[PDB]
Amino acid sequence: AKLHDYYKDEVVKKLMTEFNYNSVMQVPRVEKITLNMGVGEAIADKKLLDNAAADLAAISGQKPLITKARKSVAGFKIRQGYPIGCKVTLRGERMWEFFERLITIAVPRIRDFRGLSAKSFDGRGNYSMGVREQIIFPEIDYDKVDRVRGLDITITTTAKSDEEGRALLAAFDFPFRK
Amino acid sequence: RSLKKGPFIDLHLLKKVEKAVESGDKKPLRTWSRRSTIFPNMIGLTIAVHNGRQHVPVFVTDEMVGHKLGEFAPTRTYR
Amino acid sequence: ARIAGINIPDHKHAVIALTSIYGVGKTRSKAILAAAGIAEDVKISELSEGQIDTLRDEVAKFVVEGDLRREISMSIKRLMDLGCYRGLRHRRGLPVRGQRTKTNARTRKGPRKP
RNA sequence: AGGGCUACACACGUGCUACAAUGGCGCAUACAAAGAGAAGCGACCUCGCGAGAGCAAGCGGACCUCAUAAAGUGCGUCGUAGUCCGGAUUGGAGUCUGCAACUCGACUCCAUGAAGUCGGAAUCGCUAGUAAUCGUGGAUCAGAAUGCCACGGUGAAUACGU
RNA sequence: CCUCCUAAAGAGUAACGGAGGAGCACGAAGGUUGGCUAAUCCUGGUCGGACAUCAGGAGGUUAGUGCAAUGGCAUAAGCCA
Ligand SMILES: [Mg+2]
Ligand SMILES: [Mg+2]
Ligand SMILES: [Mg+2]
Ligand SMILES: [Mg+2]
Ligand SMILES: [Mg+2]
Ligand SMILES: [Mg+2]
């Protein structure tokens, strides 16, 4: 809950004196991390899926949720089932704890990071930004690992507006860029 | 484009490009001194660089300096 | 050890092996041993901790791996998005070093396109 | 004056360099011939990683210079791997030539290190200091040689027979 | 043999009238208990692009229904165990 507490004390008030929230029950809290990693393919190897899963079950102590195809029809094959990826959201504890190993060690274990987007937001206040590639963070033998990975993470905050979304996140050691 | 120590350009441009500086940015500089080097004062200026048949325009940009004025004007016609 | 580009060029010789670093070669590899105080006949694998430690440390200076294979495109890219004979050559896949395109260019451009 | 004869999706001839261990690489190190040169060869030493620059001797030559030949021999290293093979390509930056190095010079430095694991049908030269292989000089020429002409080192196999 | 129109708002009703299907399929695609809810679009996100999965919003039976058509379906028959 490292960031968790930091939020209550440090944060909150910052927003309270910023947007002037009349009630503590208004300060944009952290609404679960998402994670996805759409390994897609599958139809070809079917093993790169479990790899992605395990790769996800790594950064996240919880078991990955192998998703399924929906429309089936597409510019390719894909049918009713047709597994594609594994979301696996985060929950408070494991969430912030993850939100910790992230930005504090994940983003830090860069690739050439020199400024994070400030428009990765949707429009309601929630954010989303795919690392474009698994930063090889605390994985099973960083060197003895599977061929790349890459995944997408969606902030998703109880922010009533993207603007407030900027205050939050950044309210913490969130990298970002100007 | 080696030349040891001593960037060189035909007298023409040297006197034309410098004049353009004061006179101000206007019509290009009709010249064949393509074998010359691009200078910073040339930036933002126009120069009619001949290739074979007729001359051609040039947009002297920042990075486009240490290079030869000629390398920015194809001569041959392929397909 | 990862050394730099994560590469594990071991079970050989400090020099020849270290050359595995996308950014170093016969010269840089045999020279880094100087500031790193390392021999040549030394097997990178057998290398004691500090031995490899110094390596990574000294190589941390000269640009290597990613940044190189990466930035190396910046320069080429420039000419390309610049409009000079240099870049112009790359897009057409033709020899930039001014070679004979009439014949012998299998390396620069594609092999056979009959 | 600028450019083109250096263009390219191609095909054919002549060549050069590899595909490695009869080798690569390091260090040490033995032997040659023929030549060249006042708008030329250019030492010596100072510096530069090096190309090369500074100073400046000597020679118009069995005196000087080009100019510490290579293979090789001793040892060491590598261990048959696309590999310490092989070097194309390209990037960054330099040396010199010359008004002039974009088009289109030669070379140096660092990095990059492809194809290629001996090549179908078919085809070429060579009968002895030859083949094979290893270095060296010159004409042209400001500067662009794997080409042409020439020099020597090492050094075979085979030829019943028409 | 099944569906719709012709069929004049009960049933029914003809033509060598206008249209389309059946001669099956499922030991689960049946039974029950418990739970779930589409399509499509906009916004934002590794590779994901017209459209693969993820997040949010609009939307509301426009989805789906084993196979024609009609009628029905959220208390869902629709979907999962
Ligand atoms: Mg010709
Ligand atoms: Mg001469
Ligand atoms: Mg000569
Ligand atoms: Mg009726
Ligand atoms: Mg009636
Ligand atoms: Mg979209």
UniProtKB/Swiss-Prot annotation, chain A:
The keyword Metal-binding does not apply. GO terms for cellular component: cytoplasm; cytosol; cytosolic large ribosomal subunit. InterPro entries: Ribosomal_uL5 (IPR002132), Ribosomal_uL5_bac-type (IPR020930), Ribosomal_uL5_C (IPR031309), Ribosomal_uL5_CS (IPR020929), Ribosomal_uL5_dom_sf (IPR022803), Ribosomal_uL5_N (IPR031310). Coiled coil: none annotated. One of its GO terms (biological process) is ribosomal large subunit assembly. Keywords: Acetylation, Ribonucleoprotein, Ribosomal protein, RNA-binding, rRNA-binding, tRNA-binding. PROSITE patterns: RIBOSOMAL_L5 (PS00358). SUPFAM superfamilies: RL5-like (SSF55282). The modification N6-acetyllysine is found at K2. GO terms for molecular function: 5S rRNA binding; RNA binding; structural constituent of ribosome; tRNA binding. Gene3D superfamilies: 3.30.1440.10. This is one of the proteins that bind and probably mediate the attachment of the 5S RNA into the large ribosomal subunit, where it forms part of the central protuberance. Its 5S rRNA binding is significantly enhanced in the presence of L18. In the 70S ribosome in the initiation state was modeled to contact protein S13 of the 30S subunit (bridge B1b), connecting the 2 subunits; the protein-protein contacts between S13 and L5 in B1b change in the model with bound EF-G implicating this bridge in subunit movement. In the two 3.5 A resolved ribosome structures the contacts between L5, S13 and S19 are different, confirming the dynamic nature of this interaction. Identified as a multicopy suppressor of the slow growth phenotype of an rsgA (yjeQ) deletion mutant. Belongs to the universal ribosomal protein uL5 family. Part of the 50S ribosomal subunit; part of the 5S rRNA/L5/L18/L25 subcomplex. Contacts the 5S rRNA; cross-links to the P site tRNA. Forms a bridge to the 30S subunit in the 70S ribosome, contacting protein S13 and S19. PANTHER family: 60S RIBOSOMAL PROTEIN L11-RELATED. This is Large ribosomal subunit protein uL5.
Swiss-Prot record, chain B:
Disulfide bonds: none annotated. GO terms for biological process: cytoplasmic translation; ribosomal small subunit assembly. GO terms for molecular function: rRNA binding; structural constituent of ribosome; tRNA binding. It comes from the Bacteria. Keywords: Ribonucleoprotein, Ribosomal protein, RNA-binding, rRNA-binding, tRNA-binding. The keyword Transmembrane helix does not apply. Pfam families: Ribosomal_S19. InterPro entries: Ribosomal_uS19, Ribosomal_uS19_bac-type, Ribosomal_uS19_CS, Ribosomal_uS19_SF. GO terms for cellular component: cytoplasm; cytosol; cytosolic small ribosomal subunit. Belongs to the universal ribosomal protein uS19 family. In the E.coli 70S ribosome in the initiation state it has been modeled to contact the 23S rRNA of the 50S subunit forming part of bridge B1a; this bridge is broken in the model with bound EF-G. The 23S rRNA contact site in bridge B1a is modeled to differ in different ribosomal states, contacting alternately S13 or S19. In the 3.5 angstroms resolved ribosome structures the contacts between L5, S13 and S19 bridge B1b are different, confirming the dynamic nature of this interaction. Bridge B1a is not visible in the crystallized ribosomes due to 23S rRNA disorder. Protein S19 forms a complex with S13 that binds strongly to the 16S ribosomal RNA. Contacts the A site tRNA. NCBIfam families: rpsS_bact. Part of the 30S ribosomal subunit. Binds S13 and L5 and cross-links to the A site tRNA. This is Small ribosomal subunit protein uS19. The lineage of its organism: Bacteria, Pseudomonadati, Pseudomonadota, Gammaproteobacteria, Enterobacterales.
From Swiss-Prot, chain C:
One of its GO terms (cellular component) is small ribosomal subunit. PANTHER family: 30S RIBOSOMAL PROTEIN S13/40S RIBOSOMAL PROTEIN S18, SMALL RIBOSOMAL SUBUNIT PROTEIN US13M. Pfam families: Ribosomal_S13. HAMAP family: Ribosomal_uS13. NCBIfam families: uS13_bact (TIGR03631). Belongs to the universal ribosomal protein uS13 family. Residues 93-114 are annotated as: Disordered. The lineage of its organism: Bacteria, Pseudomonadati, Pseudomonadota, Gammaproteobacteria, Enterobacterales. This is Small ribosomal subunit protein uS13. Keywords: Ribonucleoprotein, Ribosomal protein, RNA-binding, rRNA-binding, tRNA-binding.
